[PDB]
Design a protein around this ligand. Structure first.
Ligand code: MG
Length: 410
RNA sequence: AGACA
RNA sequence: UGUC
């Protein structure tokens, strides 16, 4: 066992060219207050609806005003009004109607307070909203035993993003890392049932385009996986047409058919064709990686964040979070296009990249033990699946630009 | 469904 | 079962 630590001087870029170090929520929020987030969403109506059945509850109220002052002071979204809508019974139809009222009054976003756990209701409403407008759900029974300050700080991180905002991105070296990173693969709905996903990222960690395949039979996996990728690269190029792609990386993950060696060839085929369709430089350097969780990592005898453990020249363990125990990410170099002189240098770039992408979750102020390239699609699968199992409204990427371009799944 | 181990 |  041989190991190397990721170079540990790196920063987020927020508003007005300011930088803040990572892993320090204090200086991030202070930075946001002064400089604003990297990109302030443009809202049409300057209006958010708050939809709940709580009376004149003094809780909706401290909430309301905390949302209100933070959205303005932390996020720099000005002149925002929150209108409230109240529903009789916590049943679907009753809440939906308050959704529709809100909508035809002209709202940029809906915050929806549910009373308790209730999975069929939640996924039915979320499904409706995702096709309609950016949404942030809430539970009153969680909102009651949590410190408001923590709950709102975090809640807004992802609500701002769903509104098209960009809280913060990575400060990247233009030279090092991939031009784009494609998170790809599939997750199991049922046992005969598959959906494929393909999501394109910039090395600063921002999602550019998101494509999802039809819920399809497991047999036809290798078909829609190849299909879906092409579609992401198509939709990304039409949107970024003068952007030469010389370094491509694939991040393959999710619970999918166990047909690996054949999965590999087809991703190679998918690339060669993208070359010949002049969507990617004719001499693209690329790598195809499997990222997987594994067993917790124990250093014995009496493990720093960003530690890269070489299990073999194709397999690495990468630690994403400080042990203060730790589940690392398993990263396999399944296939590549690299000369051998480069190779070692390219591996570590690609492992550094993964480590940085793990600091890029927009669900809140604490980032997941995953790179966004694996986490985001996992949250997709999350929603697509329950929308299947609970009879919600189908989610359709082709049919409008905002779903292919916004992190609706946070 | 505020999230994170 | 914990953390803010
Ligand atoms: Mg969420």
């Amino acid at each position: 066992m041989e190991y190397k630590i990721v170079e540990n001087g790196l920063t987020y870029r927020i508003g007005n060219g300011a930088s803040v170090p990572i892993s320090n929520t204090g200086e991030l929020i202070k930075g946001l207050r002064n400089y604003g987030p990297y990109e302030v969403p443009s809202l049409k109506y300057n209006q958010i609806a708050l939809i709940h059945n709580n009376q004149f509850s003094s809780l909706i109220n401290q909430l309301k005003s905390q949302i209100s002052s933070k959205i303005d002071e932390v996020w720099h979204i000005h002149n925002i009004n929150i209108s409230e809508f109240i529903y009789d019974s916590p049943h679907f139809d009753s809440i939906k109607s308050q959704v529709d009222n809100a909508i035809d009054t002209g709202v940029d976003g809906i915050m929806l307070v549910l009373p308790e756990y209730n999975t069929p209701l939640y996924y039915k409403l979320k499904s409706y909203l995702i096709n309609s407008i950016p949404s942030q759900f809430m539970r009153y029974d969680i909102l009651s035993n949590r410190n408001l300050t923590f709950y709102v700080d975090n809640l807004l991180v992802q609500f701002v993003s769903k509104l098209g905002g960009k809280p913060w991105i990575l400060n990247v070296d233009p030279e090092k890392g991939s031009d784009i990173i494609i998170g790809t693969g599939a997750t199991r709905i049922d046992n005969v049932n598959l959906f494929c996903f393909a999501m394109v990222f910039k090395k600063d960690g921002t999602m550019l385009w998101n494509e999802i395949s039809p819920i399809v039979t497991s047999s036809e996996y290798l078909t829609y996986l190849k299909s879906t990728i092409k579609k992401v690269v198509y939709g990304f190029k039409k949107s970024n047409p003068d952007w030469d792609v010389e370094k491509l990386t694939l991040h393959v993950s999710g619970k999918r058919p166990k047909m690996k060696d054949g999965e590999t060839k087809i991703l190679k085929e998918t690339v060669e064709e993208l070359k010949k369709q002049e969507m990617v430089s004719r001499d693209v350097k690329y790598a195809i990686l499997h990222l997987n969780e594994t067993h917790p990592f124990w250093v014995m005898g009496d493990p720093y964040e960003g530690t890269k453990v070489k299990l073999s020249s194709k397999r690495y363990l990468l630690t994403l979070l400080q042990p203060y125990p730790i589940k690392p990410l398993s990263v396999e170099i399944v296939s590549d296009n690299w000369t051998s002189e480069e190779y070692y240098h390219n591996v570590h770039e690609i492992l550094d990249e993964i480590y940085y992408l793990s600091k890029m979750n927009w669900r809140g102020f604490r980032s997941r033990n995953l790179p966004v390239t694996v986490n985001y699609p996992k949250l997709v699968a999350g929603i697509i699946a329950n929308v299947n199992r609970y009879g919600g409204y189908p989610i359709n990427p082709e049919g409008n630009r905002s779903l292919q371009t916004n992190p609706w799944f946070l």
